[PDB]
Amino acid sequence: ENCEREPIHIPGSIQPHGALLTADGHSGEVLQMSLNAATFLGQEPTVLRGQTLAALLPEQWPALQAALPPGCPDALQYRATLDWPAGHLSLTVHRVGELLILEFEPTEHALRNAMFALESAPNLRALAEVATQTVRELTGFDRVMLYKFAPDATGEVIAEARREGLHAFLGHRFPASDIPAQARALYTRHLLRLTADTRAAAVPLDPVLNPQTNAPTPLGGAVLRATSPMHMQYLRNMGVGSSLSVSVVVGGQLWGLIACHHQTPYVLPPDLRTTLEYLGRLLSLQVQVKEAADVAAFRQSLREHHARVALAAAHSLSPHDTLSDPALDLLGLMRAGGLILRFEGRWQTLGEVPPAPAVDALLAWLETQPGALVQTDALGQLWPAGADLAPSAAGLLAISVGEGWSECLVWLRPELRLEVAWGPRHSFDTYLEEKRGYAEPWHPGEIEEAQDLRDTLTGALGERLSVIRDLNRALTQSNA
Amino acid sequence: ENCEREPIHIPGSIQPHGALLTADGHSGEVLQMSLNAATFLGQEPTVLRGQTLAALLPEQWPALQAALPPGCPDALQYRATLDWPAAGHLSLTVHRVGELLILEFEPTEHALRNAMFALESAPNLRALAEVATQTVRELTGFDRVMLYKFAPDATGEVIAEARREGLHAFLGHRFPASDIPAQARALYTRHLLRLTADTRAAAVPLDPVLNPQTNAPTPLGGAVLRATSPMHMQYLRNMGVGSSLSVSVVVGGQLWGLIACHHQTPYVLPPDLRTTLEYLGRLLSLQVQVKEAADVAAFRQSLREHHARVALAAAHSLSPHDTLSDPALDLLGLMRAGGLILRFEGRWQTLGEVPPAPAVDALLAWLETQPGALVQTDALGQLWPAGADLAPSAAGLLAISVGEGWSECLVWLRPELRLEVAWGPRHSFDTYLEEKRGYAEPWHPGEIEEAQDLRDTLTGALGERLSVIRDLNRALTQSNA
Ligand SMILES: C=CC1=C(C)/C(=C\c2[nH]c(/C=C3N=C(/C=C4\NC(=O)C(C)=C4C=C)C(C)=C\3CCC(=O)O)c(CCC(=O)O)c2C)NC1=O
Ligand SMILES: C=CC1=C(C)/C(=C\c2[nH]c(/C=C3N=C(/C=C4\NC(=O)C(C)=C4C=C)C(C)=C\3CCC(=O)O)c(CCC(=O)O)c2C)NC1=O
């Protein structure tokens, strides 16, 4: 119930497969330190506590402070490899406030070929398939998926690269409840996340509170962050050991999220994580290319039909006489059953349309809607009173030429029934309850041609204005 | 004069620091081969000619043909490293044009990850440009490393530099469209890397020159060992430049910019570091789309308080003249202009310092003939030759047509300012010197985005005004009847 208010940013504990130290970003005096760090680094904790970073790491300090000035964001990272008698470790540092955060992990042509493979993917399906195929090759994970977040905050499993002897997760959809808001904010900032074990116990820090502020330490930028005790339980019921997610951020929005699950507890080398980090950058880029090609190809086919409607609405002195002529046919362009044409006051219908008292109720609903365009494939969801009028009007596309919904075109698609079918299964049942009655979902190539008719009709709303005044001016001349 | 029609794609010769073979992409029979390849590979040419690739490279073939199916674009590349007794271990790079596999041979022997995060945390486009160039100079060890930015009038502008001490700066340098022709720009959009190891070295021909498959010259656009033009070399010889490496920046299918790394002494880079640069090219094409998006969004934020007062008043604009001339709004200060023209319904109204009336009616006649929705110029003397003497009041122009046809239009006028650029690159510089005479303050892209946001709210009111005018006619007829 109150699982959306849990502070994920402040666990106060780390994952037991490395070491963590946080120290003041001016003095270098060691403040906070995990319990395990004494055994890991192979030094007495009394020595480490109250020691400068100029003493412990005497060569890395004049490089650490240079690359990390006070003022830089807590997204900037600095990696280094150093040798210790206790073998050679991995050092990863960053800066929060005036506190340097040190991370320690034990360390020990495929990328270039993958790059060109992604750049020469024909569509978004093939890009998704290849990306997942590459990840499974380099890492050697069992299951590797790719969610795509719908603008109603629901994930959709579009691709998979699985091991033989496991059921497919393809086509799976999960609600907004599983990924809360505070998690989504953190995943927009920090692109990588790693969980080596799900049944392992968290290692606390000593002392827990940062004496600089007397406040808990924010460890959002840390890879060794202990994961939620609810998300672990979720993966325990399925029986999943390792989890690695790489977030896809497009235009400052969380596009999608690769998830790499494993049956057995697994710890990945930090040399291969960097390769994945690179792939995350490459997959955020190419998605913006492939989805741009998905619409541009779709529009190209219908453009011959589109140009006849656009040029006729360009010199539209009559909105009724030209935009109702069957030689244009506005139903076939958008693949819809019904069309409503409301101009000047008179409402005109074309094709299969709901009854007249319901029409005047539908146009009353669109006026109350603040948006310029109304896009819905289920009108029963948005408008509860107009759910019985689905047989003729299930999917709706409405544009207001001008503003105020005085002059508007409405597209109506026929009714089609949809039923969802497949602990992930109790999350699946919440998605099952939401959907009842739907229609054919709107293609984004159609939306771009729908809003291109808006720009040529409203441009004619100015040419129409001129001659109307002229008719008034000539009338007054005849009156005088 | 006819240097824009030169076939750069077909040199018929290669650069002398490697080896090249082109063979049929089904049989594997060796067709074309450079003269140097006999000495380089350490085998007799008679043996190599009329030999299958299954015999010469017996392990790489079932990997070569798999990664390169017939049908894939000639942009896909495959790199491999293989050991040879003659010259040590070499670098193998293959691709596919038509039904002809193209083999390239060159002798081979934490900075990147840190650079990545440095680029992702750059505050602006100036700082991104500075860091990128600083990184390249560190990894490669070139003398001069620049970064051109192509202006939408096809002119390069040196924005950043990472130079060696004891050399004059190239910062602020600008060069015309003549130096980089069209056929070069097409090739640089496709193939992102280019390498010239020496400028005074002689080109090594292929034997035989013509591909017997088609009886046509071999297109080597995707090849790194392509011999560069005998005119571009001469250009770099006059300056005295040895090595040249360029990495092209392509944004949205358009050539954004081009890193250029020049060197005084002949230099050959290892192929292991070229791949790092190739990666940096990908990272710099990405982050530019982020930084330039932040440059305008920050600029608009400051002026948004002034912008919102103009937008809401033009939203319920029943009168275009009465509301969009009120000094409480002040449309001059928003766009930082001297003059403003307000033409609506037929009557032209002026605000601030404006040209004489016969010149005004000439200016509005010019904008009607212009096909574009928005006219953006900082020099009106360039676009309109008759209106060059009217620069003291109208030098820079920003015009928007609410609706279409230039019936109702707003015109912004910026005052006259002289700018002069001052410094074989010098004869190319003189062609840029002749172009500019009289200018104004150049338009900020943050202003253009607010200028076109006033278009969308005024034209939306062109529809609301329409309704009530007819209503007044309809009520009149009712009273008449
Ligand atoms: C196929 C399996 C399957 C999963 C993994 C799923 C949910 C799910 N929960 C996530 C995050 C999360 N989910 C939770 C927590 C919860 N977990 C819950 O399901 C509930 C009820 C809570 C409580 C609010 C939190 C806090 C995170 C983010 C953890 C982090 O910050 O790393 C993520 C994104 C990160 C990842 O891939 O690990 C997924 C996909 N639904 C599915 O069907
Ligand atoms: C100080 C440096 C400086 C140069 C180098 C310049 C122009 C210039 N010409 C270029 C390409 C080119 N320039 C030429 C050729 C020519 N060269 C000429 O200046 C003329 C007259 C021709 C003939 C048209 C060709 C053919 C290319 C493309 C070569 C390729 O495809 O790699 C490039 C991009 C590739 C590179 O840098 O190697 C630049 C920057 N003007 C300058 O200010």
Short mmCIF file of N, CA and C and ligand atoms in Angstrom, two decimals, chain B residues 3 8 148 170 173 175 178-181 184 188 194 226 229 232 235 239 244 258 260 262 425, ligand 2:
data_model
loop_
_atom_site.label_atom_id
_atom_site.label_comp_id
_atom_site.label_asym_id
_atom_site.label_seq_id
_atom_site.Cartn_x
_atom_site.Cartn_y
_atom_site.Cartn_z
N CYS B 3 36.70 21.17 -61.10
CA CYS B 3 37.26 20.40 -60.00
C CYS B 3 36.14 19.81 -59.14
N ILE B 8 36.23 11.05 -57.59
CA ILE B 8 37.05 10.78 -56.42
C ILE B 8 36.89 9.31 -56.02
N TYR B 148 35.45 21.51 -37.23
CA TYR B 148 34.62 22.39 -38.03
C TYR B 148 33.16 22.17 -37.68
N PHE B 170 44.15 28.61 -35.20
CA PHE B 170 43.25 28.55 -36.34
C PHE B 170 41.82 28.87 -35.91
N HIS B 173 38.61 30.78 -37.79
CA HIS B 173 38.80 30.64 -39.23
C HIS B 173 37.52 30.11 -39.87
N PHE B 175 35.98 29.06 -43.97
CA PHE B 175 36.34 28.75 -45.34
C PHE B 175 35.08 28.52 -46.17
N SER B 178 33.69 26.17 -51.75
CA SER B 178 34.46 25.81 -52.94
C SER B 178 35.49 24.72 -52.63
N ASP B 179 35.97 24.69 -51.39
CA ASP B 179 37.07 23.82 -50.98
C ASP B 179 36.59 22.38 -50.83
N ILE B 180 35.39 22.19 -50.27
CA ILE B 180 34.77 20.88 -50.16
C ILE B 180 33.61 20.80 -51.15
N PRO B 181 33.79 20.14 -52.33
CA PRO B 181 32.72 19.96 -53.31
C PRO B 181 31.64 18.98 -52.85
N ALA B 184 32.28 14.97 -52.62
CA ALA B 184 33.08 14.65 -51.45
C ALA B 184 32.18 14.56 -50.21
N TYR B 188 31.44 11.47 -47.51
CA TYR B 188 31.77 11.69 -46.11
C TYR B 188 30.55 11.49 -45.21
N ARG B 194 38.55 8.76 -42.63
CA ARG B 194 39.45 9.01 -43.75
C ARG B 194 40.87 9.21 -43.21
N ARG B 226 42.35 4.27 -49.99
CA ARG B 226 42.03 5.04 -51.18
C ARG B 226 43.03 6.18 -51.33
N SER B 229 43.02 12.86 -53.74
CA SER B 229 43.06 13.69 -54.94
C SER B 229 44.43 14.36 -55.11
N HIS B 232 44.11 18.07 -53.57
CA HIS B 232 43.99 18.21 -52.13
C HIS B 232 45.34 18.00 -51.45
N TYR B 235 47.40 21.16 -52.00
CA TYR B 235 46.88 22.13 -51.05
C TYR B 235 47.59 22.00 -49.71
N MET B 239 51.06 24.35 -47.47
CA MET B 239 51.10 24.60 -46.04
C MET B 239 52.24 23.80 -45.41
N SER B 244 46.99 13.59 -42.39
CA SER B 244 45.65 14.12 -42.26
C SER B 244 44.68 12.98 -41.94
N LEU B 258 33.13 18.09 -38.81
CA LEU B 258 34.25 17.27 -39.25
C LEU B 258 35.49 17.62 -38.45
N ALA B 260 39.36 17.44 -37.87
CA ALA B 260 40.51 17.34 -38.76
C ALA B 260 41.80 17.36 -37.93
N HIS B 262 45.77 17.27 -38.32
CA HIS B 262 46.89 17.50 -39.22
C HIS B 262 48.21 17.33 -38.47
N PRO B 425 45.76 28.39 -47.61
CA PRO B 425 44.45 28.71 -47.04
C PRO B 425 44.01 30.17 -47.19
C1 LIG C 2 43.71 24.76 -43.56
C2 LIG C 2 43.03 23.76 -44.06
C3 LIG C 2 42.02 23.82 -45.02
C4 LIG C 2 41.58 22.77 -45.90
C5 LIG C 2 42.26 21.44 -46.06
C6 LIG C 2 40.38 23.26 -46.53
C7 LIG C 2 39.41 22.53 -47.17
C8 LIG C 2 39.02 21.21 -47.09
N1 LIG C 2 38.86 20.40 -48.20
C9 LIG C 2 38.46 19.14 -47.81
C10 LIG C 2 38.21 18.08 -48.68
C11 LIG C 2 38.52 17.96 -50.03
N2 LIG C 2 39.09 18.94 -50.79
C12 LIG C 2 39.31 18.39 -52.02
C13 LIG C 2 40.02 18.99 -53.03
C14 LIG C 2 40.41 20.28 -53.15
N3 LIG C 2 41.19 21.00 -52.23
C15 LIG C 2 41.00 22.35 -52.47
O1 LIG C 2 41.16 23.23 -51.67
C16 LIG C 2 40.59 22.46 -53.86
C17 LIG C 2 40.62 23.67 -54.76
C18 LIG C 2 40.11 21.18 -54.21
C19 LIG C 2 39.42 20.88 -55.40
C20 LIG C 2 38.13 20.99 -55.53
C21 LIG C 2 38.66 17.09 -52.10
C22 LIG C 2 38.46 16.26 -53.34
C23 LIG C 2 38.29 16.76 -50.83
C24 LIG C 2 37.75 15.46 -50.31
C25 LIG C 2 38.79 14.34 -50.21
C26 LIG C 2 38.25 13.04 -49.64
O2 LIG C 2 37.23 12.54 -50.16
O3 LIG C 2 38.86 12.52 -48.68
C27 LIG C 2 38.37 19.15 -46.37
C28 LIG C 2 37.96 17.98 -45.51
C29 LIG C 2 38.97 16.83 -45.49
C30 LIG C 2 40.32 17.13 -44.87
O4 LIG C 2 40.41 18.03 -44.00
O5 LIG C 2 41.30 16.45 -45.24
C31 LIG C 2 38.70 20.41 -45.94
C32 LIG C 2 38.74 20.89 -44.52
N4 LIG C 2 40.36 24.64 -46.40
C33 LIG C 2 41.17 25.00 -45.35
O6 LIG C 2 41.16 26.09 -44.80
#
